[PDB]
Amino acid sequence: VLSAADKTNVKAAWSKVGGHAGEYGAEALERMFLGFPTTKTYFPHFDLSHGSAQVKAHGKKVGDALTLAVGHLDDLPGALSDLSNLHAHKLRVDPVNFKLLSHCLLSTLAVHLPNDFTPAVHASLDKFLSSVSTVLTSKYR
Amino acid sequence: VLSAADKTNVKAAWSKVGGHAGEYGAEALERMFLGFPTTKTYFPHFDLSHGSAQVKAHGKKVGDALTLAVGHLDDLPGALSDLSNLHAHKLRVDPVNFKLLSHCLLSTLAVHLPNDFTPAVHASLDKFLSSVSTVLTSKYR
Amino acid sequence: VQLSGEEKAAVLALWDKVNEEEVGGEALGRLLVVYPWTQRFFDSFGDLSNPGAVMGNPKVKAHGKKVLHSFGEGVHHLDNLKGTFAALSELHCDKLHVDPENFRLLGNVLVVVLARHFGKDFTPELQASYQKVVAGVANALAHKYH
Amino acid sequence: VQLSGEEKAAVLALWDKVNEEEVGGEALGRLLVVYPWTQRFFDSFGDLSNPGAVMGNPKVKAHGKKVLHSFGEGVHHLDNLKGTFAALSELHCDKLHVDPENFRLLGNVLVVVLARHFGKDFTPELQASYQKVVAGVANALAHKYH
Numbered sequence: 001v002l003s004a005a006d007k008t009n010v011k012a013a014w015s016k017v018g019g020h021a022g023e024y025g026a027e028a029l030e031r032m033f034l035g036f037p038t039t040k041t042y043f044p045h046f047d048l049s050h051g052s053a054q055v056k057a058h059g060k061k062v063g064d065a066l067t068l069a070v071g072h073l074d075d076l077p078g079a080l081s082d083l084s085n086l087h088a089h090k091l092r093v094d095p096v097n098f099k100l101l102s103h104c105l106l107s108t109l110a111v112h113l114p115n116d117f118t119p120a121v122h123a124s125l126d127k128f129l130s131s132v133s134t135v136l137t138s139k140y141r
Numbered sequence: 142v143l144s145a146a147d148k149t150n151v152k153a154a155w156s157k158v159g160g161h162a163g164e165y166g167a168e169a170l171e172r173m174f175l176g177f178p179t180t181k182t183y184f185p186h187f188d189l190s191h192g193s194a195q196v197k198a199h200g201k202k203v204g205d206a207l208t209l210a211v212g213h214l215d216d217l218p219g220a221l222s223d224l225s226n227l228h229a230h231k232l233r234v235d236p237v238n239f240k241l242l243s244h245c246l247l248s249t250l251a252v253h254l255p256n257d258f259t260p261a262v263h264a265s266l267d268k269f270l271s272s273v274s275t276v277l278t279s280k281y282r
Numbered sequence: 283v284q285l286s287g288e289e290k291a292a293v294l295a296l297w298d299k300v301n302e303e304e305v306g307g308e309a310l311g312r313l314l315v316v317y318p319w320t321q322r323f324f325d326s327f328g329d330l331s332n333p334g335a336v337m338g339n340p341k342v343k344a345h346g347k348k349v350l351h352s353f354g355e356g357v358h359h360l361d362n363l364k365g366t367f368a369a370l371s372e373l374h375c376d377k378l379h380v381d382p383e384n385f386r387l388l389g390n391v392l393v394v395v396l397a398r399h400f401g402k403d404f405t406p407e408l409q410a411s412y413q414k415v416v417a418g419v420a421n422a423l424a425h426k427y428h
Numbered sequence: 429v430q431l432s433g434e435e436k437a438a439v440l441a442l443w444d445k446v447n448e449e450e451v452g453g454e455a456l457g458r459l460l461v462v463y464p465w466t467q468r469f470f471d472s473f474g475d476l477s478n479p480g481a482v483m484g485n486p487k488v489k490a491h492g493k494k495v496l497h498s499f500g501e502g503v504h505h506l507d508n509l510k511g512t513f514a515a516l517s518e519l520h521c522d523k524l525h526v527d528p529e530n531f532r533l534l535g536n537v538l539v540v541v542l543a544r545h546f547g548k549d550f551t552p553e554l555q556a557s558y559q560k561v562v563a564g565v566a567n568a569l570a571h572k573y574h
C-alpha cells in the first residue's frame with residue numbers, strides 16, 4: 001500500500017467489497033469478540049450479542065473509515081488523523097488488538113469473496129490493514 | 142522519533158554517546174547473539190566469538206548507520222534506503238529480530254549511560270529505533 | 283487445548299471435509315507471498331519469485347500437505363499437544379531455528395484458507411474454536427524455544 | 429527457565445543485590461512511560477500524565493514491589509515456574525484480561541533497569557541468562573490464555 005501494485009490491489013479489492021463494507025466491518029468485529037475474548041473489554045457499553053444493533057452500526061463506521069483510507073492511500077496520516085487521537089491518546093487501545101482485527105477482517109473477505117481474494121490481493125490487503133493500524137497508533141510515536 | 146520533543150531529546154542523547162557509537166554497536170550485537178540465539182543464523186560467515194574481529198567491525202557500521210539517521214530524522218526513508226533493500230529484499234531478515242536488537246541496544250546505552258538514560262529519553266529512543274526498523278523492513282510493502 | 287464437547291465435535295466434523303493436499307499448499311503458498319521473509323527457510327524449493335509460480339510449486343504443495351497432516355494429528359489429539367509435537371519443536375528451534383511467532387502467522391494464514399474454502403459454514407462460532415486449536419498448535423511447537 | 433549449574437548460581441547472586449522497591453517502581457515506572465497503552469490498566473493510581481509524576485507515584489512504587497517480589501518467587505522456583513504463577517496467570521487472563529505480549533514487554537523493561545543499576549556487571553553473558561528467565565516467567569504467567 002506504499003507501492004503501485006498494492007494501491008492497485010487495494011483499490012481494485014475494495015472495489016469488489018463495494019456496498020458490503022458495513023456488513024463485513026460488523027462480522028469482522030463479531031469474529032473478533034468471539035475469537036479473541038480479551039478485545040471485549042474496550043466495549044462494555046456495547047451489546048456484544050449476535051445481530052446486536054450496536055455492533056451492526058459500529059461495524060458500519062469501521063466499514064466507512066476504511067473506504068476513506070482506500071480513497072486516500074497517498075495520505076493516510078492526514079486522513080485518519082482524528083481517528084489516531086481516539087484510539088491512542090483517548091481510548092488507549094493496545095496495538096496487538098489491531099493485528100487481531102486485521103486478521104478477522106481478512107477472514108471475512110475470505111468468506112464472501114473467495115474468487116476475488118487471490119494470494120496477490122491477499123498480500124496487498126495485509127500491508128494495507130497494516131499501513132492503517134500504524135497510522136492509528138502513531139501517537140505512541 | 143516523530144515530533145519536536147521527540148527529535149530534540151534524541152539528538153542530545155545521541156551526542157552524549159558521540160565517540161562510542163560503534164563500540165556500543167558491537168556490544169549490542171554480542172548481547173543479541175548470546176541472549177537471542179536464533180539471530181546467529183544470519184551470520185555464519187562471521188566469527189561470533191566474544192570480542193571477534195568481524196563483530197566489532199560490523200558493530201561500527203551499525204553505529205554509523207544509526208548516527209546517519211538522527212541527522213536525517215525528517216527523512217528516514219531516504220537516508221536508510223539502500224539499507225532496506227539489503228535487509229528486506231536480499232537477506233530477508235525476519236522483522237522480529239529488529240525488536241531484539243533494539244532491546245539489546247537499549248540495554249547497552251543503559252549500562253554505559255545510567256544518568257543520561259532517564260525514562261523520557263528512554264521513550265524517545267524507542268521511537269527512533271522502532272521507526273528505524275520500520276524502514277529496513279519496508280520492502281515488505 | 284481445552285475446548286468443549288459442542289466444540290471438539292464441531293472441529294472434527296469440519297476437518298473431515300479438509301483436503302490436506304489442497305489446503306496445505308494454499309496455506310504454505312500464502313505464507314511465502316504475504317510474509318516474504320519466510321522464504322529464507324525454503325531456498326531448496328527453487329523459484330519463489332512471484333505469486334503465480336510459488337502456488338504452482340510442487341515442493342510448496344508437497345510440504346504444505348505435510349504441514350496440514352501434522353495439524354490433523356493435533357486436531358485428533360487436543361490433549362497431548364505438547365507431546366504430539368515435542369519432537370517437532372526441537373526440529374524447528376534447533377536444526378532450523380525458526381522464530382516461535384512464525385507459527386502463529388502460519389496458523390492464521392491457515393484459518394483464512396479454511397474461511398475461503400468453507401465460507402458461511404466457517405461461522406464466527408467455529409472460527410472461534412479454530413483460533414484456539416491454532417492457538418495451541420503454534421504453542422506446542424515453541425515449547426522449547428526460550 | 430532451565431538454566432545451567434553456573435547460570436542459576438549467577439542469577440541468584442545478582443538477585444541478592446536486587447533492591448525490590450527500587451527496581452520495581454522504576455521498572456513499572458518505565459513501562460507506563462514507554463508503553464502508554466498500559467496505563468489503561470492502572471487508572472486507579474491517579475495521575476500518570478508525564479514521566480516525573482509517574483515515577484514519584486506512590487501507587488506505582490508499591491505495586492512495583494509486588495511485581496518484583498513475585499518475580500523473586502519465580503526466580504527461586506525456576507523448576508516449578510508455571511505453577512508458582514497459576515495463582516496469577518488466572519488473575520490476568522480472567523479478572524484483568526491483560527494481553528500475553530505485555531508480559532514479554534515488562535520483563536524487557538525489567539532487564540534494562542537491571543542493566544542501568546548494575547552497569548558492566550550485568551555482562552552480556554548474564555543478560556542472556558535473565559532473558560531465558562524473563563520469558564518463561566512471561567509465558568507460564570499466560571499459561572491460562574490459550
Ligand code: HEM
Pocket residue numbers: 039042043061062065066083086087091093094097098101102132133136
Ligand atoms: C481497523 C482499524 C480501526 C479503525 C479504522 C477503527 C475505526 C473506528 C471508528 C471510525 C471509530 C469511531 C466510531 C464512532 O464515531 O463512534 C472508532 C471508535 C472506537 N474503536 Fe475502532 N477502529 C479500529 C480498530 C479498533 C480496535 C483494534 C479496537 C479494539 C481493540 C477498537 C475500539 C474502538 C472503541 C472502543 C471505539 C469507541 C466506540 C464507542 O465507544 O462508541 N477499534 N473506531
Ligand code: HEM
Pocket residue numbers: 180183184202203206207224227232234238239242273274277
Ligand atoms: C539497528 C538496525 C540495523 C541497522 C542500522 C543495520 C545496519 C546494517 C549495515 C550498516 C549493514 C551494512 C554493513 C556493510 O556494509 O557490511 C548491515 C548488514 C547486515 N545486517 Fe544489519 N542492521 C540492523 C539490523 C539487523 C538485524 C535485525 C539483523 C539480523 C538479525 C541484521 C543482519 C545483517 C547482516 C547479516 C548483514 C550483512 C553483513 C555482511 O554479511 O557483511 N541487521 N546492517
Ligand code: HEM
Pocket residue numbers: 320323324326345348349352353370373374378380381384385388389419420423
Ligand atoms: C503449526 C505450524 C507448523 C507446523 C505444524 C510445521 C510442521 C512441519 C513439519 C511436519 C515439517 C517436516 C518435519 C519432518 O520431516 O518430519 C516441517 C519442516 C520445516 N519447517 Fe515447519 N511447521 C510449521 C511452521 C513453520 C514455519 C512458520 C516455518 C517458516 C520459517 C517453518 C519452516 C520449516 C522448514 C525450513 C522445514 C524443513 C523443510 C525442508 O527443507 O524440506 N515451519 N515443519
Ligand code: HEM
Pocket residue numbers: 466469470472491494495498499516519520524526527530531534535566569
Ligand atoms: C511481568 C509480569 C508481571 C508480573 C510478575 C505481575 C505480577 C502481579 C502481581 C503480584 C499482582 C498483584 C495481584 C494481587 O493483588 O494478588 C498483579 C496485579 C496486577 N497486574 Fe501485574 N504482573 C505482570 C504483568 C502485568 C502487565 C503487563 C499488566 C498490564 C496490563 C498487569 C496488570 C496488572 C493489574 C492492573 C493488576 C492489579 C493491580 C491493582 O489493581 O491493584 N500485570 N500483577
